[PDB]
């Protein structure tokens, strides 16, 4: 199918306590492979996947220099935004950045993206034509004018359409055993007696990859979306994910309820019913 490479950066200001904390992480699809922590003693971009360690010291030197550059740009952006919004230095603030590229089944460039956020809310983003910017406030409008003047869109487009996708391909090839795999979910069902007349049925999907899944409960084949409890997909800690969905049913009606599981590792979606 399609694949993605994405870099996430986060810098939070510590007033008076020191320079802003900066943390960066890299992902291919749903697998992390690099990190940087400005509070860490190494002060290096470190590997987090086994298939990226095959890279020599030059790759790491380059990625460390680049991530430090991005840290410095964030360090300036914090004050720039504090000025654009007329905020006092006493407050701790957050600047988040995320960019990357998606590739199709032919492994050709499919799309790119580049977005910023301040204190948790959208600040500016690159449009899907890779030629224009969407801005939220008048400060984002100012950043947009600056970037339109400096021809940022053309350079970013060149990067995304060349190097981002090329090294996404190379990472997919180096870590084919990890990244080019699909793990179907192992599914089962659980039954407990919440009351003398009600019982909770719980549909479990475990040990699946990629994280994109869908669990649906149905009654008489009708969607139970409003009365089904559905937890966020959670990481198992070893490259796989977990999820479950529960419904409360009157005792003696379980055979009317079905759990439907949709995942790329399944040839057909699964239908489960209590026995």
């Amino acid at each position: 199918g399609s694949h993605s490479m994405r870099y996430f950066y986060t810098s939070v200001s510590r007033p008076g306590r020191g320079e802003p904390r900066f943390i960066a992480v890299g992902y291919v699809d749903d697998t992390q492979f690099v990190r940087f922590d400005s509070d860490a003693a190494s002060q290096r971009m470190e590997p987090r996947a086994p298939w990226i360690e095959q890279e020599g010291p030059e790759y790491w030197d380059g990625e460390t220099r680049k991530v430090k550059a991005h840290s410095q740009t964030h360090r300036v952006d914090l004050g720039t935004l504090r000025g654009y919004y007329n905020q006092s230095e006493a407050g701790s603030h957050t600047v988040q950045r995320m960019y990357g590229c998606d590739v199709g089944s032919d492994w050709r460039f499919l799309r790119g993206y580049h977005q910023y956020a301040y204190d948790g809310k959208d600040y500016i983003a690159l449009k899907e034509d890779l030629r224009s910017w969407t801005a939220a406030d008048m400060a984002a409008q100012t950043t947009k004018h600056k970037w339109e003047a400096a021809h940022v869109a053309e350079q970013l487009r060149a990067y995304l359409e060349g190097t981002c996708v090329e090294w996404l391909r190379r990472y997919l090839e180096n870590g084919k055993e990890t990244l080019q795999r699909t793990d179907a979910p192992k599914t089962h069902m659980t039954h407990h007696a919440v009351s003398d007349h009600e019982a909770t049925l719980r549909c479990w999907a475990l040990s699946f990859y990629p994280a994109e899944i869908t669990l649906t409960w149905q009654r008489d084949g009708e969607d139970q979306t409003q009365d089904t409890e559905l937890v966020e997909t959670r990481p198992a800690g070893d490259g796989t994910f977990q999820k479950w969905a529960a419904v409360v049913v009157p005792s003696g009606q379980e055979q009317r309820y079905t759990c439907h599981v949709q995942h790329e590792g399944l040839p057909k979606p699964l239908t489960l019913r209590w026995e």
């Binding site: 680049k66 991530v67 740009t73 952006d77 720039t80 600056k146 970037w147 940022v152 990067y159």
Partner: peptide
């Protein structure tokens, strides 16, 4: 691999 340019707001 990361982008080489320094981008400011």
């Amino acid at each position: 691999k990361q982008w080489l340019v320094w981008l400011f707001l």
